[PDB]
Amino acid sequence: RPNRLIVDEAINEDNSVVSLSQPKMDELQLFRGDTVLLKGKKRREAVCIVLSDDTCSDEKIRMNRVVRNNLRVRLGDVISIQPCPDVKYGKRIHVLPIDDTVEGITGNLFEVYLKPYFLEAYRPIRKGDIFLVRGGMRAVEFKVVETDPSPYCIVAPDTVIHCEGEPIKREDEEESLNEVGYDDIGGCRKQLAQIKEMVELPLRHPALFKAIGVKPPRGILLYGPPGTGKTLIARAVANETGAFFFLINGPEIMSKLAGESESNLRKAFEEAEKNAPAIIFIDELDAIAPKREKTHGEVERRIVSQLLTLMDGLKQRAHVIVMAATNRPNSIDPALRRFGRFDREVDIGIPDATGRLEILQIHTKNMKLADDVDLEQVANETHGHVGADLAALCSEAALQAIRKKMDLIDLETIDAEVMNSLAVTMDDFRWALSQSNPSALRETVVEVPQVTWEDIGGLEDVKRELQELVQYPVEHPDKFLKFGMTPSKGVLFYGPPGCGKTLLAKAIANECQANFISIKGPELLTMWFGESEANVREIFDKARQAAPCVLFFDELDSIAKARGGNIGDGGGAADRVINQILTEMDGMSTKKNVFIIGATNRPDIIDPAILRPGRLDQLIYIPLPDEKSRVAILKANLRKSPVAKDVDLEFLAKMTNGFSGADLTEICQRACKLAIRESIESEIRREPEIRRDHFEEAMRFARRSVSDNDIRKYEMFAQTLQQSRGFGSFRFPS
Amino acid sequence: RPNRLIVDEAINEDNSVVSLSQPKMDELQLFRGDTVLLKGKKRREAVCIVLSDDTCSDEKIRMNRVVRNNLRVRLGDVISIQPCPDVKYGKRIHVLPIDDTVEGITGNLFEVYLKPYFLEAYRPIRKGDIFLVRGGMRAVEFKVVETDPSPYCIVAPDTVIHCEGEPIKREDEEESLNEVGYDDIGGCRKQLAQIKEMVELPLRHPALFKAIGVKPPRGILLYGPPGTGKTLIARAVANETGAFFFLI
Numbered sequence: 001r002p003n004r005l006i007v008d009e010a011i012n013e014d015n016s017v018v019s020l021s022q023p024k025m026d027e028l029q030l031f032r033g034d035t036v037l038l039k040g041k042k043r044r045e046a047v048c049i050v051l052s053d054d055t056c057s058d059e060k061i062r063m064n065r066v067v068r069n070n071l072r073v074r075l076g077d078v079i080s081i082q083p084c085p086d087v088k089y090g091k092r093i094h095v096l097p098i099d100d101t102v103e104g105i106t107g108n109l110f111e112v113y114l115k116p117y118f119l120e121a122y123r124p125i126r127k128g129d130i131f132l133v134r135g136g137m138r139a140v141e142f143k144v145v146e147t148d149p150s151p152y153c154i155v156a157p158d159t160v161i162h163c164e165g166e167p168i169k170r171e172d173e174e175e176s177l178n179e180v181g182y183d184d185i186g187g188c189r190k191q192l193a194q195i196k197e198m199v200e201l202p203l204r205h206p207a208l209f210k211a212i213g214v215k216p217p218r219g220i221l222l223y224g225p226p227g228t229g230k231t232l233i234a235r236a237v238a239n240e241t242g243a244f245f246f247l248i249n250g251p252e253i254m255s256k257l258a259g260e261s262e263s264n265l266r267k268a269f270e271e272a273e274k275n276a277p278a279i280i281f282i283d284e285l286d287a288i289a290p291k292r293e294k295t296h297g298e299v300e301r302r303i304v305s306q307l308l309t310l311m312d313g314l315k316q317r318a319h320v321i322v323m324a325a326t327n328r329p330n331s332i333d334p335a336l337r338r339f340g341r342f343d344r345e346v347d348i349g350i351p352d353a354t355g356r357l358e359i360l361q362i363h364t365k366n367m368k369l370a371d372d373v374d375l376e377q378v379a380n381e382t383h384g385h386v387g388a389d390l391a392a393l394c395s396e397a398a399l400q401a402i403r404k405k406m407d408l409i410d411l412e413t414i415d416a417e418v419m420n421s422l423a424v425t426m427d428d429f430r431w432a433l434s435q436s437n438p439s440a441l442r443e444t445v446v447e448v449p450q451v452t453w454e455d456i457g458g459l460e461d462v463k464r465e466l467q468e469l470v471q472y473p474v475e476h477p478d479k480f481l482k483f484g485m486t487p488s489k490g491v492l493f494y495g496p497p498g499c500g501k502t503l504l505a506k507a508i509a510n511e512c513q514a515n516f517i518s519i520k521g522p523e524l525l526t527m528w529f530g531e532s533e534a535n536v537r538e539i540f541d542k543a544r545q546a547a548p549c550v551l552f553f554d555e556l557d558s559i560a561k562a563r564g565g566n567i568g569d570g571g572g573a574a575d576r577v578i579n580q581i582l583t584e585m586d587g588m589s590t591k592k593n594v595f596i597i598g599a600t601n602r603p604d605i606i607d608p609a610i611l612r613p614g615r616l617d618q619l620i621y622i623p624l625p626d627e628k629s630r631v632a633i634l635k636a637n638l639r640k641s642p643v644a645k646d647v648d649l650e651f652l653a654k655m656t657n658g659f660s661g662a663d664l665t666e667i668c669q670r671a672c673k674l675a676i677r678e679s680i681e682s683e684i685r686r687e688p689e690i691r692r693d694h695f696e697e698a699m700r701f702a703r704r705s706v707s708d709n710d711i712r713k714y715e716m717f718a719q720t721l722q723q724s725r726g727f728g729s730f731r732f733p734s
Numbered sequence: 735r736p737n738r739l740i741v742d743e744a745i746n747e748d749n750s751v752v753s754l755s756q757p758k759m760d761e762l763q764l765f766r767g768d769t770v771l772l773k774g775k776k777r778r779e780a781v782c783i784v785l786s787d788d789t790c791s792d793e794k795i796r797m798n799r800v801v802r803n804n805l806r807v808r809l810g811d812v813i814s815i816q817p818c819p820d821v822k823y824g825k826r827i828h829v830l831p832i833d834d835t836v837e838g839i840t841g842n843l844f845e846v847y848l849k850p851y852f853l854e855a856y857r858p859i860r861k862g863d864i865f866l867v868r869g870g871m872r873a874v875e876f877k878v879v880e881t882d883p884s885p886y887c888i889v890a891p892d893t894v895i896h897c898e899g900e901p902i903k904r905e906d907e908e909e910s911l912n913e914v915g916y917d918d919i920g921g922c923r924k925q926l927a928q929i930k931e932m933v934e935l936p937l938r939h940p941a942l943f944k945a946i947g948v949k950p951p952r953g954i955l956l957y958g959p960p961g962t963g964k965t966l967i968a969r970a971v972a973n974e975t976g977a978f979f980f981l982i
């Protein structure tokens with residue numbers, strides 16, 4: 001039906017633009033830039049202009065938070081189209097701010113909020129419409145009080161907008177439009193989508209679970225390092241679904257004697273029961289319910305048991321979802337993670353560069369920036385930053401922007417024009433990057449890598465084999481069932497140092513857009529020296545929760561070398577950490593699409609048990625890079641560096657016969673550093689590109705890292721493992 | 735504007751010397767050793783001689799703790815210049831110590847505190863000026879009670895300074911001038927500068943964070959081995975910014 005649509009979140013941040021689809025417009029006969037009168041629930045309605053985009057489905061309309069709240073509806077609700085009958089332009093339109101959103105800032109609101117928002121933008125306005133505008137490092141809401149030319153109008157440049165004063169009191173059943181929402185979360189698409197899925201039916205459709213009886217998820221546990229926005233995500237979900245958000249703070253619960261703690265837990269659960277669909281959020285769950293063995297007080301044990309029995313009592317269809325955030329997935333009572341109490345677990349995790357960019361764009365939307373703030377350069381060099389680190393960085397830059405113009409124009413309830421006249425310059429961000437101190441620097445990176453097959457030259461057979469083991473079971477799961485045969489879940493790269501094993505693993509992960517986890521030799525040696533091989537389990541857990549994933553074990557022979565050679569020190573090839581890796585590999589399913597890649601420069605000293613079937617059964621030799629791979633190395637290292645066009649990198653890759661990838665990396669690490677040095681000397685004497693002479697000067701110090709004997713040994717190993725037997729003449733008779 | 739400056743900490747420990755910059759003096763037409771009448775907040779004012787130094791910026795004036803407290807202002811505040819119209823020398827100038835800063839030490843204060851401080855040093859004096867002097871392994875404050883030749887004067891060698899007795903009670907809204915400050919901290923430039931940065935906007939500009947909404951630092955943790963003056967540094971920052979220091 002043309003008068004029945006479903007609400008979705010708007011991609012853009014436009015105040016009064018709704019996105020639809022061309023097939024929907026086909027049955028509506030509407031233009032690209034016309035206006036319609038959308039009628040919402042509770043008799044309310046608004047006027048908005050439509051837009052065309054292909055992201056939404058045929059019968060889905062995208063609306064932003066402010067227009068969605070104007071219609072008194074939420075995501076997924078039913079909204080008609082009802083095109084507006086072309087109401088003429090407005091004349092006076094009186095608008096006033098809301099008292100709560102204007103408190104603290106006073107002055108003339110025309111040149112700062114009203115005029116820039118209404119400049120060169122014909123935005124429809126109704127009597128009951130309230131609109132939010134971002135400026136002066138704030139988000140302020142304005143409500144229209146009256147409109148002389150009919151209740152509907154369209155803002156014209158000559159319209160004399162009036163703002164007398166006396167801000168209106170906040171209404172009864174209208175919520176703040178800038179507190180929390182899905183658009184306040186940065187790049188948590190997978191996790192936020194998971195939470196939306198688990199939470200949609202229990203809360204948006206409560207009577208369904210009083211009439212069907214299927215058990216919905218009752219306990220969701222958000223876990224991840226601190227500062228990743230778990231509380232923010234829970235608040236956003238509760239606000240968007242409209243369910244009553246009850247917040248339980250771990251420290252606040254545990255700061256109240258030995259009485260009121262239990263009373264407060266019980267009262268929170270009863271209040272959530274008495275108040276319709278609700279989300280109970282228990283922030284810092286490990287403060288309330290840690291491992292009951294490590295507790296050394298009776299009241300703590302009673303707190304944990306009371307939480308357990310409250311969670312068990314929330315097995316009925318009371319429409320109360322209990323959410324909990326912890327930084328300790330393994331330091332909360334295991335009895336909480338059982339079925340019926342906290343069944344679902346969501347790992348928030350570190351934001352990637354895209355997520356960091358999204359968070360930075362969210363935190364800087366109200367702030368007036370400059371033109372030089374890239375906001376993507378910082379997002380690429382904020383490694384190890386959780387969203388809280390990024391918020392701290394943004395606030396630090398903004399504060400230093402205020403620390404440069406601090407007492408020039410006095411900020412004595414201060415005027416709006418001076419507030420709007422601020423700017424943050426990119427060098428402030430580059431300053432804060434050196435004063436950042438990321439919290440999650442020492443955290444396992446789980447991200448789809450940016451290495452593609454372009455960054456790798458040659459290795460055509462290796463690329464083919466890798467995509468046979470990874471790309472086929474992922475992108476063609478129809479096979480491996482028709483033929484009834486599981487994909488191999490592991491491969492062992494072997495070859496000389498510096499030949500692209502890491503890049504091959506990253507590129508195969510990126511081709512399937514799979515997560516990539518790298519476990520380097522120092523980490524295996526850390527587990528071996530400290531006898532903390534139990535952490536191997538955790539690594540595989542991270543791989544399983546991040547599926548599809550490539551779990552890469554670089555220099556898998558590190559422990560074997562640390563023990564000596566092939567024998568080692570008296571003992572055999574088995575060690576505790578590689579034994580744990582074997583155990584964890586046997587415990588995977590091949591249906592998780594977790595692929596293990598081990599790399600070793602010394603396949604001779606590797607434990608043979610890891611080469612057995614059901615393990616890294618395929619061995620791939622990664623040889624010394626051929627000339628095409630050398631050209632790729634040179635191009636990849638030289639990209640991001642201004643290099644002269646006359647350099648014959650193809651020629652450069654011809655006498656680098658037995659050179660490894662690290663050899664050419666050092667070749668530019670020297671030529672390009674000579675260029676830097678020449679720049680500095682010429683700048684000293686005076687006060688653009690890596691020339692051919694720089695590359696000749698660097699090649700004058702070119703040495704092969706891997707000797708001929710080592711290459712001979714690698715070739716011998718490859719022969720004895722790949723030359724097979726004399727079965728090349730086999731043929732079925734007739 | 736010639737009548738709008740920003741306060742900074744004084745490099746030297748001189749009691750009544752303020753440091754400025756030559757470009758600032760260019761628009762003021764003042765000599766190297768002349769006197770000016772600096773007017774502070776809350777209607778208070780004092781008289782002081784200026785000095786030239788290149789460390790401060792063009793529009794920054796350096797003042798020490800005692801003269802800054804005489805103007806009822808703190809670091810970074812707005813102070814005008816208003817050069818003094820060359821008031822003649824004083825005649826009697828009666829000064830008396832404050833009761834709290836003199837308790838425990840008694841006797842004649844002329845040869846120990848007054849005369850050495852006023853010997854070969856023409857220091858301007860106002861009626862409301864209170865000045866601190868270091869001697870006898872102590873730091874003692876003296877407040878002027880009266881001045882016969884106009885409220886402003888300049889101390890002359892032949893001036894008969896009078897100290898009768900009866901020390902004045904400590905006033906209501908005036909703090910002790912020798913408790914804690916930035917000049918009581920030794921060689922913590924980096925750390926003290928960091929703390930000043932994080933603390934300046936939240937405390938000196940409170941209404942800014944009721945009108946902008948950017949999150950300022952709410953928790954600062956000073957850590958280091960014992961005896962490094964963390965409590966001293968915190969007390970100094972609180973005293974200099976004027977915010978209420980609550981000690982737990």
Ligand SMILES: Nc1ncnc2c1ncn2[C@@H]1O[C@H](COP(=O)(O)OP(=O)(O)OP(=O)(O)O)[C@@H](O)[C@H]1O
Binds near residue numbers: 495497629636637
């Ligand atoms: N085939 C290749 N394609 C792209 N880059 C390569 C290739 N071979 C080597 N390199 C270059 O080698 C450098 C790093 O080598 P890499 O980490 O892949 O080696 P490796 O085979 O894992 O050996 P090692 O264990 O000795 O570090 C990078 O500069 C990379 O560009």
Ligand SMILES: Nc1ncnc2c1ncn2[C@@H]1O[C@H](COP(=O)(O)OP(=O)(O)O)[C@@H](O)[C@H]1O
Binds near residue numbers: 184187
């Ligand atoms: N994913 C995110 N997107 C946007 N902002 C974030 C994100 N994560 C953290 N922040 C910022 O960090 C601040 C604190 O995050 P917080 O909710 O305490 O983390 P957690 O929920 O993991 O304890 C929030 O005010 C928010 O502004």
Ligand SMILES: Nc1ncnc2c1ncn2[C@@H]1O[C@H](COP(=O)(O)OP(=O)(O)O)[C@@H](O)[C@H]1O
Binds near residue numbers: 918921959961963965
């Ligand atoms: N950096 C410093 N500058 C000047 N005096 C100091 C300094 N550090 C310590 N002191 C002297 O040491 C005494 C005790 O220092 P204290 O404040 O207890 O150290 P902390 O603050 O680290 O506990 C103070 O009375 C002070 O006189």
Ligand SMILES: [K+]
Binds near residue numbers: 231232
């Ligand atoms: K929060």
Ligand SMILES: [K+]
Binds near residue numbers: 965
């Ligand atoms: K102390």
Ligand SMILES: [Mg+2]
Binds near residue numbers: 284325326
């Ligand atoms: Mg939390």
Ligand SMILES: [Mg+2]
Binds near residue numbers: 501502554599600
């Ligand atoms: Mg490797």
